[PDB]
Design an enzyme around this catalytic site. Structure first.
Site, PDB file in Angstrom:
ATOM      1  N   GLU A 174       0.910  -1.283   0.021  1.00  0.00           N
ATOM      2  CA  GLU A 174       0.047  -0.078  -0.182  1.00  0.00           C
ATOM      3  C   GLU A 174       0.871   1.269  -0.194  1.00  0.00           C
ATOM      4  O   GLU A 174       2.087   1.260   0.432  1.00  0.00           O
ATOM      5  CB  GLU A 174      -0.754   0.002   1.242  1.00  0.00           C
ATOM      6  CG  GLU A 174      -1.808  -1.331   1.281  1.00  0.00           C
ATOM      7  CD  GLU A 174      -2.852  -1.180   2.347  1.00  0.00           C
ATOM      8  OE1 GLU A 174      -4.219  -1.877   1.975  1.00  0.00           O
ATOM      9  OE2 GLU A 174      -2.809  -0.391   3.251  1.00  0.00           O
ATOM     10  N   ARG A 207      -0.581 -11.141   1.463  1.00  0.00           N
ATOM     11  CA  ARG A 207      -1.537 -11.896   1.224  1.00  0.00           C
ATOM     12  C   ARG A 207      -2.288 -11.497   0.242  1.00  0.00           C
ATOM     13  O   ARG A 207      -2.216 -10.508  -0.364  1.00  0.00           O
ATOM     14  CB  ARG A 207      -2.617 -12.105   2.451  1.00  0.00           C
ATOM     15  CG  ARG A 207      -3.104 -10.954   2.791  1.00  0.00           C
ATOM     16  CD  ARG A 207      -4.112 -11.033   4.000  1.00  0.00           C
ATOM     17  NE  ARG A 207      -4.265  -9.693   4.638  1.00  0.00           N
ATOM     18  CZ  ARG A 207      -4.968  -8.636   4.284  1.00  0.00           C
ATOM     19  NH1 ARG A 207      -5.281  -8.821   2.754  1.00  0.00           N
ATOM     20  NH2 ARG A 207      -5.170  -7.713   4.748  1.00  0.00           N
TER      21      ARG A 207
END
Ligand SMILES: Nc1ncnc2c1ncn2[C@@H]1O[C@H](COP(=O)(O)OP(=O)(O)O)[C@@H](O)[C@H]1O
EC number: 6.4.1.1
Lengths: 490, 41, 261, 41
Positions: C40, C56
């Site tokens: 992110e 993930r």
């Protein structure tokens, strides 16, 4: 100029249009026969109107005048014919325009051009496209068998302008059948013989034109897997076509259409053997299998049809087509129609209420709803099509797989479906390879190795049921007495 | 309205549950559709 | 919390993208990442600031699959089976040949009743109909007919994702889909999502995280209009609790009427 | 089998019809289901 739109059709293609039109902020109007009273597409528009309390459902969606009447009653700006009723009929398109309604389609002259198999033969040749050699015009005046005989080449056939015929005077005397066939189902009744091109791939090209002179093609669909008359499975683009061959067909597609100034979406159909190709027909309209093409290109074909009908330009901010070299396929997609054609029994359309119904979803999967939902009753009157299912992936293997598994995950109870058959096809070594031709079904007898699958559930539901209603022998028939728990040590 | 209109079909009703509510099995505009009603008897 | 996810961002410069990616390939390179992962970031004009990694798969992976046509989860599996990324099973294209065709949007149909302040509603689903057609993707969650939704779990009925060459088209479709779905027995966030999806500020493209808090009229709702829903309430009241001043009897068999017009 | 089980709920049995065939309303694994059974009055 299109504030509100009527769809002169039923079923999945109506439901597709309503959704296009919805997304364009265009308001939507549906018609229905007496026999479509409870049919899904009726509920999927904003408005819907019965056609005639008195018009046979057979003929309720081909009555030019009443459709337009229902249209005028409701300020319809445009009608979308869909496919396969009033979709290729000039009289209807003519009568639309005169009443001030925009027929979403090509031009009258593109309809008349192509409505005839002979009219469209000339067009093809006069645009320098290969053609299947055949009776130079149709024939009438009888003994019309004895003549074209021994002058073309061994493989032949009788087709019937809109059977094999290997000669040995199997011509005059398989010329008994014709009185009740090309009179009732076909348009203008005429008949003309053709060189039978053996073991052909069947490949069609999607084309779109605005009203400004811009045409593009959206590559080729491979429509080779079919069982007799009709198409069973389509794949786009053709997994088994060479890079150049795909070009030449695509070039011809666009040579025909550029040449007679085509407009809106239509499709050029070809027949492909080894390295030669031939022009079959044009389809001046959307086809069932366009979904496939939307999936690999990204272009919305139906949304585009409407927008072209409203005078938008292909390359404008509103249709937004890529220049040709930017139109690309990305991966392969496949389609098949879940119908109620029962495989075990000579493929009857089957007829009933759907009690349970469950689709699929996730990666690669796209469902275009049709006649089928939990509540529905299916009738014997229109061609059964419960759901259109299409899948899509970078690879054709991944695509197909993705298809068997959503054929298998599906659940439709109350009618029989073609799912067992379709599964066998998707599964087959021949299909998986990509190399298949149109004799795929002829040559594969394993395909009809349907066997009624066991299901632990239904059987169990049918015992419990019996015992509940009509009890079990020696056992004092009485409501199931309430027993003590007592836990099972272990 | 003009060209709108409901279509309702009643399938069955279930004998009340423990809160005395019955299950109506409806079909309205091609969706199965069920509704709960407390009986008054 | 994330409400609606678009890919690829309709607001990034050609070059920001390139750097924001360039960076991710170097962090993950450096620590030799394997299987799937989300780095992110946070962008503010021309400079951007690493915030997070998600070692993930993410809820919003579907968005990225639609625009590139890669099956992230399947690769995840193939990658664990020990398999060349560029080999047979995964056929993943080389870096220089991965692209993003068009735009794609996601949102989670939940049971967050945005009128009781987004408390996740619970109970039995008594009608469930979703949608489909052109580039619409439904991943099922808890929502089916007769499904039973409990307090105990982050509520999510359907993941709905849409895609298209144009971000407006992908918007026009998502909104269509939302207005088509009919989910009964439980409250949902559909009215709120519709409102986001239809906002000038959203469909524009330039929007920041402050988008929502800075937009009052997203919460402008009138509790859904039912001609069809209330009426069933009636037809099956009378049928059982009668009607005050009429013979309790069954609906008597009446003459067919002929109605001149 | 191991880890394969059927969860079945009987919702209603209807009233018999023209020729004595009752309609069981079940749910079985998150699936509405309908079975037809011959009554013997
Ligand atoms: N002359 C021919 N030689 C070989 N195959 C043919 C010939 N004509 C038609 N076919 C095959 O049979 C199918 C039916 O013919 P067609 O005229 O296209 O029917 P329809 O109008 O229903 O599509 C075609 O899809 C094509 O694959």
């Amino acid at each position: 100029q299109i504030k509100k739109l009527l769809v002169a059709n039923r079923g999945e293609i109506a439901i597709r249009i309503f959704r296009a039109a919805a997304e364009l902020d265009i308001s939507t109007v549906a018609i229905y026969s007496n026999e479509d009273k409870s049919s899904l597409h009726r509920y999927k528009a904003d408005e819907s109107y019965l056609v005639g309390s008195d018009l046979g459902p057979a003929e309720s969606y081909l009555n030019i005048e009443r459709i337009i009447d229902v249209a005028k009653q409701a300020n319809v700006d445009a009608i979308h014919p869909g496919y396969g009723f009033l979709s290729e009929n000039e009289q209807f398109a003519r009568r639309c325009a005169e009443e001030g309604i925009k027929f979403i389609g090509p031009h009258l002259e593109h309809l008349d051009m192509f409505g005839d198999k002979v009219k469209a033969r000339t067009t093809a040749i006069k645009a320098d496209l290969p053609v299947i050699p055949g009776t130079d015009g149709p024939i009438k005046s009888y003994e019309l068998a004895k003549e074209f005989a021994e002058e073309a080449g061994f493989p032949l056939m009788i087709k019937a302008t809109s059977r094999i015929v290997r000669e040995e005077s199997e011509l005059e005397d398989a010329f008994h059948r014709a009185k009740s066939e090309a009179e009732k189902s076909f348009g203008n009744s005429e008949v003309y013989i053709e060189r039978y091109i053996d073991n052909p791939k069947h490949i069609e090209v999607q084309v779109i034109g605005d009203e400004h002179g811009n045409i593009v093609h959206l590559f080729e669909r491979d429509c080779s897997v079919q069982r007799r008359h009709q198409k069973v499975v389509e794949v786009a683009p053709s997994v088994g076509l060479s890079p150049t061959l795909r070009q030449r067909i695509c070039d011809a597609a666009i040579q025909l259409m550029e040449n007679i100034k085509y407009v809106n979406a239509g499709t050029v159909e070809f027949l492909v053997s080894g390295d030669e190709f031939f022009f079959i027909e044009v389809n001046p309209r959307v086809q069932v299998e366009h979904t496939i093409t939307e999936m690999v290109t990204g272009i919305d074909i139906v949304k585009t049809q409407i927008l072209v009908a409203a005078g938008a330009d292909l390359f404008g901010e509103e249709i937004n087509m890529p220049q040709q070299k930017d139109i690309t396929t990305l991966g392969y997609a496949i389609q098949c129609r879940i119908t109620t054609e029962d495989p075990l029994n000579d493929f009857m359309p089957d007829t009933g209420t759907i009690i349970a119904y469950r689709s699929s979803g996730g990666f690669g999967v796209r469902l275009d709803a049709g006649d089928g939902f939990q509540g529905a009753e299916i009738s014997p009157y229109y061609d059964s099509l419960l759901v259109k299912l299409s899948t899509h992936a970078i690879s054709f293997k991944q695509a197909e797989e993705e298809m068997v598994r959503s054929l298998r995950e599906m659940r439709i109870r109350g009618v029989k479906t073609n799912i067992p058959f379709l599964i066998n096809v998707m599964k087959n070594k021949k299909f998986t390879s990509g190399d298949y031709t149109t004799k795929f079904i002829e040559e594969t007898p394993e395909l009809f190795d349907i066997q009624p699958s066991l299901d632990r559930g239904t059987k169990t539901l049918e015992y419990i049921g019996n015992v509940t209603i009509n009890g079990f022998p020696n056992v004092e028939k009485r409501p199931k007495p309430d027993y003590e728990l007592a836990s099972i040590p272990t | 309205d003009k060209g709108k209109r409901l279509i309702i079909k009643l399938e069955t009703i279930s004998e009340p549950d423990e809160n005395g509510n019955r299950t109506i099995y409806y079909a309205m505009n091609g969706q199965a559709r069920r509704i709960y009603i407390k009986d008054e008897n």
